[PDB]
Amino acid sequence: TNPYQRGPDPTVSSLEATRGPFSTSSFTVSRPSGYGAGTVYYPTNAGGKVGAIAVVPGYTARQSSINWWGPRLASHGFVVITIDTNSTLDQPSSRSSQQMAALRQVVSLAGTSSSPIYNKVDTARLGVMGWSMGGGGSLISAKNNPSLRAAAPQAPWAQESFSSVTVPTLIVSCENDSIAPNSSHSFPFYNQMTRNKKANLVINGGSHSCANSGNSDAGLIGKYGVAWMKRFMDDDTRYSKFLCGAEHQADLSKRAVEAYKENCPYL
Numbered sequence: 001t002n003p004y005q006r007g008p009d010p011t012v013s014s015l016e017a018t019r020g021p022f023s024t025s026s027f028t029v030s031r032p033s034g035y036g037a038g039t040v041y042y043p044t045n046a047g048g049k050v051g052a053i054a055v056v057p058g059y060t061a062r063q064s065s066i067n068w069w070g071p072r073l074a075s076h077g078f079v080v081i082t083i084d085t086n087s088t089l090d091q092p093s094s095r096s097s098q099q100m101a102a103l104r105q106v107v108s109l110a111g112t113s114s115s116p117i118y119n120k121v122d123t124a125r126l127g128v129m130g131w132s133m134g135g136g137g138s139l140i141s142a143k144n145n146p147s148l149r150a151a152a153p154q155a156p157w158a159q160e161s162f163s164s165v166t167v168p169t170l171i172v173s174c175e176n177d178s179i180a181p182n183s184s185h186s187f188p189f190y191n192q193m194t195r196n197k198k199a200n201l202v203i204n205g206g207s208h209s210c211a212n213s214g215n216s217d218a219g220l221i222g223k224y225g226v227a228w229m230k231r232f233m234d235d236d237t238r239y240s241k242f243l244c245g246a247e248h249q250a251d252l253s254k255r256a257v258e259a260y261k262e263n264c265p266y267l
Contacts, residue, residue: 004125004234006046006077012250015223015242020076022046027116029081033108034101036084039063040109041070042117043077051125051149051233052079052110054102056095058132058157058179060088066131066154068213072222078229079121081106092158095137099128100145125149125233129225131212132157132180135171139189142167150232152225154211155180162189168197168232168266172221174206175258190261197266199228199243202259217256231266240266 007021014020022043029038043050053073057065067082074080081102085095103126110121127150128138136158142151146166154172157180173186180186182202190200201224203210203217211221223242230239241247244264251257 002235004048004051004122005236005238006048006050006234010227010230010238010242012242012247015226016219018218018222019071020226022075022077024071024074025116026070029105029109032083033105035098035105036086037063038084038102038105039067039070039082040106040117041074041080041082042120043074046077046120049120049122050077050079051127051229052081052103052106052121052123053127053129053150053229053233054099054106055080055082056085056099056130056134056137058130058134061131061134062088065209065212066129066134068218069129069225072218073226073229076226076230078127078233079106079117090133092133092136092140092160095130095134096140096144099130099134099137099141103128127151127229127233129153131155132208135180136160136185139165139169142169150229152228154221155186155208156189157185158189161192163192163194165193166195168228169193170199170201170224170228172211172224173200173202174208174210175202175204176206177208177210179208197232197263199224199262200260201257204256204258206258220251220254220256
């Protein structure tokens with residue numbers, strides 16, 4: 001009855017795993033359109049079209065800071081473009097434009113018979129993710145384009161207000177972040193957003209890079225990013241219990257969970 005539902009029923013173990021059930025390939029974008037460079041990750045046989053997610057790094061950083069999300073999410077039934085920005089010194093407005101440019105090109109290549117993602121993408125089902133100034137850029141994208149189905153920025157950094165945001169938004173925060181300190185960024189952004197479904201995962205003892213490629217909480221952080229994108233990009237209420245149910249409750253007693261805020265239930 002849910003035309004967007006993909007892959008078998010989830011479990012605690014399937015979500016914490018380094019991979020979902022789908023085979024995946026990647027490719028470099030030949031002529032990046034409005035951004036610096038791109039890698040596209042995709043399931044080879046998802047059993048239907050999937051949503052697409054554009055992922056941006058922070059100031060000075062490159063695809064390698066954020067690109068573990070590529071395989072982690074693509075293996076779960078999503079197309080994922082990880083970008084480098086035209087410049088490593090690009091600020092959040094700039095990263096937002098380049099993020100949407102990246103989603104547009106994924107739309108362009110979904111319609112390019114020569115591309116490996118040809119007719120693999122539901123180009124109506126789009127999401128945004130990113131680290132630090134790239135996380136701030138994700139929030140700016142959701143604010144400027146409310147047809148986006150999901151935002152899951154990590155340790156976001158921005159000098160903008162997000163009171164108008166209507167897109168379902170998970171912020172992953174690092175407790176000890178002195179680069180985008182939560183008291184000036186994550187926490188105000190969370191509090192400003194009154195018009196949306198939302199959650200804030202705060203990682204215990206986490207430095208600014210606590211959610212980057214090779215982080216030691218990838219099990220838990222991966223679980224929340226996949227559940228989030230499954231719930232909101234795929235409308236998939238099989239994942240609701242990991243966000244708002246007893247499965248979510250069980251996580252609150254974990255060492256790595258400093259705090260969790262949400263406005264459950266998600267109706």
